[PDB]
Amino acid sequence: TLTENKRKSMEKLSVDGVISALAFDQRGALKRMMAQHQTKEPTVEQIEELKSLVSEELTPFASSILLDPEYGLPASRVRSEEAGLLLAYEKTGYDATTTSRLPDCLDVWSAKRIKEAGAEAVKFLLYYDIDGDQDVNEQKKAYIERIGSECRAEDIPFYLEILTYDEKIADNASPEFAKVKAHKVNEAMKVFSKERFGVDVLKVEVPVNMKFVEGFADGEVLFTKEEAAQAFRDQEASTDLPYIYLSAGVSAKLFQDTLVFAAESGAKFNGVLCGRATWAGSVKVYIEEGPQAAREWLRTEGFKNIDELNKVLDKTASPWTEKM
Amino acid sequence: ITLTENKRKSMEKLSVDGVISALAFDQRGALKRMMAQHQTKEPTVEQIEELKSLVSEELTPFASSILLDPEYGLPASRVRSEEAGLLLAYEKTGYDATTTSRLPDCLDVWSAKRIKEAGAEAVKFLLYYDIDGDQDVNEQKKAYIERIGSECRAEDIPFYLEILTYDEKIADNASPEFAKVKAHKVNEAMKVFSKERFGVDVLKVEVPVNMKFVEGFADGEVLFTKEEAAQAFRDQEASTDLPYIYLSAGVSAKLFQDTLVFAAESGAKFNGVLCGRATWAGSVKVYIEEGPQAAREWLRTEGFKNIDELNKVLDKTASPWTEKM
Ligand SMILES: O=P(O)(O)OC[C@@H](O)[C@@H](O)[C@H](O)[C@H](O)COP(=O)(O)O
Ligand SMILES: [Ca+2]
Ligand SMILES: [Ca+2]
Ligand SMILES: [Cl-]
């Protein structure tokens, strides 16, 4: 059940019920990427410009774009007229001296202001360990309730992004984390699918680390294909809400092969909010060679990434208009 | 200007014939400290919760509603008169005295949804505001109130915004220095948060004057004539079209009551009060020292007399909030 306005906004973010969205709200993550190629700290102008370049060159090929309000408003104004807009509402990153990873809204923003800035959706990122401290998770659930209520009042779709972790596992790329990932992802989805959180779309990880799956793995194999497939069916069984996948910065090819595997396995996912798998290469070029070189990278390599993704989405994603 | 069906029903449960006679008892750290004064042991959760229940049970039959804190006040809320509405506070108490920003912060495991689920007919939130303060601080404060106002719209529960004014550069808001600017701080803060975007249903505000410096009411130095004081009330009435009620903290019951009369004479159309310590402060010493049954007897006699006298004054001074609809 969508209100008239939430439905209109979902339509502006989608094509034929599929979300082929471009993600560039990266801030903390962007900065870590930029640091690989220069000693100097990134300036505001540089961040704004790279976002604007990606927006201008690639949104003609996306149903919508996700940007951050801190650096991304100029970029939002040069997006394709056919592409919708999501704006991020959370502060970037988390405190690495504690395990709680508590969420925090941008200080001078509200769901109302995000709508006033021309967004068709509010996006919020929550770090969640289903097995973690219960009082921490109580605080997290309470915080999402507030945001869900705001979005109900402002009549703007609520896109909740969940990134999972384990309080006691330092590296979520490790085999140790791979072994519990499906549990973390699928049980978190089940919680945040509860009516009281007011989510319209879940933006989630695939429930497997594909690098440890038979046929995809280049080293140790932790899972057969059938086991991986069952993780995807468990994910589909964990919600009746629309959901879309994030890339997590894997290779464009691995992400594409994952979508194919997801669909074959029985996951009726409704699109992607994909960023780095598409544009990651532009960061090095932008820093070393500058804006025009980056533009040319975007028109060629960038386009090729997003075009190949779109072809894969076309044959793998399911429309959210059927979740209704 | 307008109320949904459920917000209107809730407002009616909070009032009597359009007048809010609300009993305030969301005190936390403040209440605990009073308690200490009368006894040796650190006050217990048991004690803090019990006094609230006694006050709630014995005095809410004579109030239109009661304001409680979710942290200690839920048991007290459940023994309130069935004819009394409930407001629950949503803010963390106090402020960082090392800084001047006094930023607002909601209780960590509460939401407007949870407040409604706990049986409340209103969400109360206390904001400290200096209209003349740091513009980025105030931008952050405005964003925060927008969020809560949106929550309350979605959960369809009245939003009561309490504003307490201060100056970043004046330590004592009881000083003559603050008195000279208080009308400015109060009235301009009301103008800000009366804007539609903040979603406020009722403002809970200070009287726009320190009556202790007004001619006729002052024991010492006199800063204002009666006419100057009255103009401040008329300016306050003109600062909002929303319902608003007065908070009493800072003055004696007798002076508060005299203030209500002066307010009405001056042309203020206030819609009630949120009155606390005046009404039950006396039981606190009796509860700690003579036990619970003694407090119940104090509340039934002195306690009733206090709230009854207040109600008699409200009857001749307050205006119904339905005349603002
Ligand atoms: O840490 P930051 O600086 O806030 O940004 C990265 C982080 O939010 C990620 O979760 C992305 O927002 C999301 O995954 C979409 O990007 P991709 O994963 O598709 O590349
Ligand atoms: Ca449901
Ligand atoms: Ca399902
Ligand atoms: Cl207190």
UniProtKB/Swiss-Prot annotation, chain A:
GO terms for molecular function: 6-deoxy-6-sulfofructose-1-phosphate aldolase activity; tagatose-6-phosphate kinase activity; tagatose-bisphosphate aldolase activity. One of its GO terms (biological process) is D-tagatose 6-phosphate catabolic process. Pfam families: DeoC (PF01791). The keyword Thylakoid does not apply. Keywords: Lactose metabolism, Lyase. It comes from the Bacteria. The keyword Lyase applies. It catalyses: D-tagatofuranose 1,6-bisphosphate = D-glyceraldehyde 3-phosphate + dihydroxyacetone phosphate. Its EC number is 4.1.2.40. InterPro entries: Aldolase_TIM, DeoC/FbaB/LacD_aldolase, LacD_aldolase, Tag_1.6-dipho_adolase. Pathway: Carbohydrate metabolism; D-tagatose 6-phosphate degradation; D-glyceraldehyde 3-phosphate and glycerone phosphate from D-tagatose 6-phosphate: step 2/2. Disulfide bonds: none annotated. Belongs to the aldolase LacD family. NCBIfam families: lacD (TIGR01232), PRK04161.1 (NF003180), PRK12399.1 (NF009065), PRK12858.1 (NF009498). This is Tagatose 1,6-diphosphate aldolase 2. It comes from Streptococcus pyogenes serotype M1. The gene is lacD2.
